[PDB]
């Protein structure tokens, strides 16, 4: 398949083909129209890239973290999330808590980089 | 606290507030708004590339393998990291920054080739 091929697929199949999406995120008054359209696109991509890199997750698409998964956000065992659901419904489900996820990820990465530098401080 | 929250504070108290500042870097008017926005994006990209050519990409904190020539500064760790502000520090080492950057780049280059040789060993 191609662009958004696994739009409604189960979670695993869609996750297997995350590269096509990642590639497709990048491409006289009509002049300024195209200029501001393209700069807005570039700004959105770079904002997302920095939001990834602040977690230490830059350079990867499948990045693992160490935030404990508070069950309050959702208690669906992995079978439904990863074999009986689509990305759209899932994103609808955790829309109300994604900000807290981001904050916890910030804190965890900060502690981890500080601990890493501390380990390197040893002779 | 917030943007520039600890700019006048001690060194370490600013050292763990980097995320906010890092995150907050992103016709008569439309052309000027475009000019400002693209100047900002160019500045961010230049900073990211400068970090990337030192191997510190994706980490606000990082570590390097260049010795600290005391000619640039001789202050011991406690004086710098408990009794000084970031602005004063940038003022103190202003001339040497270029030299530091050069050495940093060179060190990475040397390190990198060494790494490749290790991955070449069977």
């Amino acid at each position: 398949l191609g662009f958004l091929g696994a739009a409604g697929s189960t979670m695993g199949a869609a996750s297997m083909t995350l590269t096509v999406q990642a590639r497709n995120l990048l491409s006289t008054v009509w002049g300024i129209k195209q200029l501001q359209a393209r700069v807005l696109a570039v700004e959105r991509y770079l904002r997302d890239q920095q939001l990834l890199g602040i977690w230490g997750c830059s350079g990867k698409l499948i990045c693992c973290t160490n935030v404990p998964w508070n069950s309050s956000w959702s208690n669906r065992n992995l079978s439904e999330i990863w074999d009986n659901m689509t990305w759209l419904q899932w994103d609808k489900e955790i829309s109300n808590y994604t900000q807290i996820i981001y904050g916890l990820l910030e804190e965890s990465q900060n502690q981890q980089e500080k601990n890493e530098q501390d380990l390197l401080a040893l002779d | 606290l917030g943007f520039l929250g600890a700019a006048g504070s001690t060194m370490g108290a600013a050292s763990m507030t980097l995320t906010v500042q890092a995150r907050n870097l992103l016709t008569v008017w439309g052309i000027k708004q475009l000019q400002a926005r693209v100047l900002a994006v160019e500045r961010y990209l230049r900073d990211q590339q400068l970090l990337g050519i030192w191997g510190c990409s994706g980490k606000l904190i990082c570590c390097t393998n260049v010795p600290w020539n005391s000619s640039w500064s001789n202050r011991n760790l406690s004086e710098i990291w408990d009794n000084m502000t970031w602005l004063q520090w940038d003022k103190e080492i202003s001339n040497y920054t270029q030299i530091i950057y050069g050495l940093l780049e060179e060190s990475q280059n040397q390190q990198e080739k060494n790494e490749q040789d290790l991955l070449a060993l069977d």
Partner: antibody
Framework: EVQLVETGGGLVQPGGSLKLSCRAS????????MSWVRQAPGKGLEWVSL????????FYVDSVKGRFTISRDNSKNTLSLQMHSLRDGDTAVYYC??????????????????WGQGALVTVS | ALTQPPSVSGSPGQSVTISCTGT?????????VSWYQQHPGKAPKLMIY???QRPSGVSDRFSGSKSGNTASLTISGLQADDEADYYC???????????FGGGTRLTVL
């Protein structure tokens, strides 16, 4: 002057467990890294374990590598040790110590400055 | 552990040196050597940290030195209060953080 209260105490079966606590005052509890050092009644002293200032890193000897678990609570200024399983050799006086490690921001120490009165662990 | 003499002896008014022998990774790798004294039944006290630098509040008399894979603690003319057990220590290995030494009974006589 800096003082290190240690409550501790020793009374446990050989296969049991026992929790140690150490409350330190007279200085910034936060800005130092703590450690546990054991001394058997007649032998030379020996380091047990180490925790950094923030408490997010820890280290143990190879003897109790997978058994003990030391933690810290900065706001209450307490150092906690949890023993596990145990081995009759442990019988010794355990002292709290400050130092042995310090963050990259501070100058390297690699020693122990202020030593508490500790306590003797007893194996039944 | 670290090899060092089980016990030594001396007299007041005579400087005394005590040695502390180690392997290559033990002392030679890192110049972080410390000596801690404890009186009988008392909690130990730090006497010197690193090869030569001395803590504040410690007597001038106590001094340290390092040569090869060995260290030494030198004390001046022994007072009546410098009777303790002195322990050598160092940072030696990222994994093996701290290897200590045996007892050293300074038999003042």
């Amino acid at each position: 002057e800096v003082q290190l209260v240690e409550t501790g105490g020793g009374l446990v079966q050989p296969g049991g467990s026992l929790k140690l606590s150490c409350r330190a005052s007279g200085y910034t509890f936060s800005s130092f890294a703590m450690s546990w050092v054991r001394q058997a009644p007649g032998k030379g002293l020996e380091w047990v374990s180490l925790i950094n200032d923030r408490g997010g890193l820890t280290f143990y000897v190879d003897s109790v590598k997978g058994r003990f678990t030391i933690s810290r609570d900065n706001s209450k200024n307490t150092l906690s040790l949890q023993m596990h399983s145990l081995r009759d050799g442990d019988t010794a006086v355990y002292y709290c110590a400050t130092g042995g490690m310090s963050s990259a921001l501070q100058s390297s120490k690699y020693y122990f400055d202020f030593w508490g009165q500790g306590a003797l662990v007893t194996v039944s | 552990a670290l090899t060092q003499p089980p016990s030594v002896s001396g007299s007041p008014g005579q400087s005394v040196t005590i040695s502390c022998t180690g392997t290559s990774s033990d002392i030679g790798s890192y110049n972080y050597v410390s000596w801690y004294q404890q009186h009988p039944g008392k909690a130990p006290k730090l006497m010197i940290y690193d090869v030569t630098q001395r803590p504040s509040g410690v007597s001038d008399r106590f001094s340290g030195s390092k040569s090869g894979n060995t260290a030494s603690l030198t004390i001046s003319g022994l007072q009546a209060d410098d009777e303790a057990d002195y322990y050598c220590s160092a940072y030696a290995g990222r994994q093996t953080f701290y290897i200590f030494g045996g007892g050293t009974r300074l038999t003042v006589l």
